[PDB]
Design a protein around this ligand. Structure first.
Ligand SMILES: CC(C)CC(=O)SCCNC(=O)CCNC(=O)[C@H](O)C(C)(C)COP(=O)(O)OP(=O)(O)OC[C@H]1O[C@@H](n2cnc3c(N)ncnc32)[C@H](O)[C@@H]1OP(=O)(O)O
Ligand SMILES: CC(C)CC(=O)SCCNC(=O)CCNC(=O)[C@H](O)C(C)(C)COP(=O)(O)OP(=O)(O)OC[C@H]1O[C@@H](n2cnc3c(N)ncnc32)[C@H](O)[C@@H]1OP(=O)(O)O
Lengths: 184, 185
DNA sequence: CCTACCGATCGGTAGG
DNA sequence: CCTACCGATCGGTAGG
């Protein structure tokens, strides 16, 4: 019902962008009128905030929740990279791509709320890079450099990847994992 | 030149507020013109973005490829390219370059195929050095495409999180990113 | 949720 | 519901 609308607004806000998508063609896609759409959601800003929260929920469910209980820090980063890459490549959630593209669209309390959820993922990586680097499991590296190098590789995928391209998302994953986390 | 000054001003705005979110009225106000005087120098809004992106590529090719394309050692070329490409972003001087990174799917038709075709000249350049470096054993074997977009991922994503007033300098980010993907081997 | 509309603003163009 | 402009306004659309 409710999240069935975000499913529809996310598809449009993703193809045409937040500022480029209108509340008219969203409601027209949801089979309503501009007025009827405002009954379920407060306004266009709260619509994006909802989409970006529903995205972080799907992210934590299919990535962090699967790798947060791995003892070896480097083994935890490998699995995290492989799961994150498949989340972007498979295209299972367009709410996640909106979070990567509209990174500076929100403002105020809605901005600070999602930003605080994103930095929880950075601190997760900063910690794993600080553990591995100290246990001698990877070449020494500043935990921040590693975290955003990690994030840069996997999250920049949404700008160039296509499922019908040469390689598969599987091959790209194996290649990046071995490229950043090789046996040491 | 007056035309160039308009691309720079219109770039600083379109970077902050975005393309679809910037108005031709406030671009004109920024250029200290009337909205009609603005449309004398630029055809329309679509062509204003196109010109901003071409000017950004000219800058990129001047401040990056032009500085490293004559290096013989392939890994030493990937190290200097990363350095220069990282600084180009952390400096924030060329907001036209940032618009290229963010508004990647804003253009359409021939204007995008044009900018996308100049972009692809940069992945072919990286794929080569990543193919030469693997054959010459200067880096661990890797598919050239996976290496090019790992190079670009680390480097270009910087525009989404870097703040010049953080704890690390743009130099420290370069050293750590280089040493992490192109370590002595 | 619809029909009816609003304040304002959109990209673009008119005559001088 | 000729160059580089200008003051004013075109037809349509935005979020609400
Ligand atoms: C300021 C400066 C630094 C800016 C730049 O130059 S960065 C440009 C390169 N890096 C980017 O992140 C840009 C992302 N946006 C773009 O438009 C990219 O340039 C491209 C998507 C590659 C545009 O290339 P274009 O050929 O015009 O469009 P296509 O998608 O049809 O081309 C396909 C090419 O994309 C890549 N690709 C996409 N999917 C896969 C895949 N599954 N496996 C392997 N490679 C893949 C790949 O490079 C492919 O090229 P080919 O395989 O045909 O040689
Ligand atoms: C699948 C998907 C949903 C996964 C995610 O959640 S995305 C992971 C977030 N990574 C991104 O690149 C997204 C784009 N960037 C952002 O959204 C923001 O920068 C966030 C890091 C998430 C939030 O930043 P926030 O703390 O709210 O506000 P700030 O502007 O003060 O950011 C400061 C933090 O960014 C980093 N940073 C920025 N500049 C520097 C620097 N010069 N040296 C070292 N680190 C730096 C750094 O992590 C910093 O945090 P602190 O150093 O203060 O602890």
């Amino acid at each position: 019902r409710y999240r069935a609308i975000l499913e529809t607004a996310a598809r449009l806000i993703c193809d045409r962008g937040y500022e480029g998508t209108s509340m008219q063609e969203i409601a027209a896609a949801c089979r309503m009128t501009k007025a009827g759409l405002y009954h379920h959601i407060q306004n266009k800003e709260q619509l994006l905030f909802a989409i970006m929260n529903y995205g972080m929920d799907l992210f934590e469910e299919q990535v962090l929740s699967r790798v947060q209980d791995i003892a070896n820090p480097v083994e935890r980063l490998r699995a995290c990279m492989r799961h994150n890459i498949l989340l972007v490549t498979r295209g299972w959630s367009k709410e996640v791509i909106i979070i990567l593209h509209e990174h500076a669209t929100l403002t105020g309390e809605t901005r600070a709320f999602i930003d605080a959820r994103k930095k929880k993922y950075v601190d997760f990586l900063e910690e794993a890079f600080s553990q591995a680097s100290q246990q001698g499991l990877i070449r020494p590296v500043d935990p921040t450099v590693g975290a955003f190098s990690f994030l840069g590789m996997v999250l920049w995928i949404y700008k160039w990847f296509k499922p019908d391209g040469r390689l598969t998302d599987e091959q790209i994953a194996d290649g990046m994992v071995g490229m950043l986390f090789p046996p040491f």
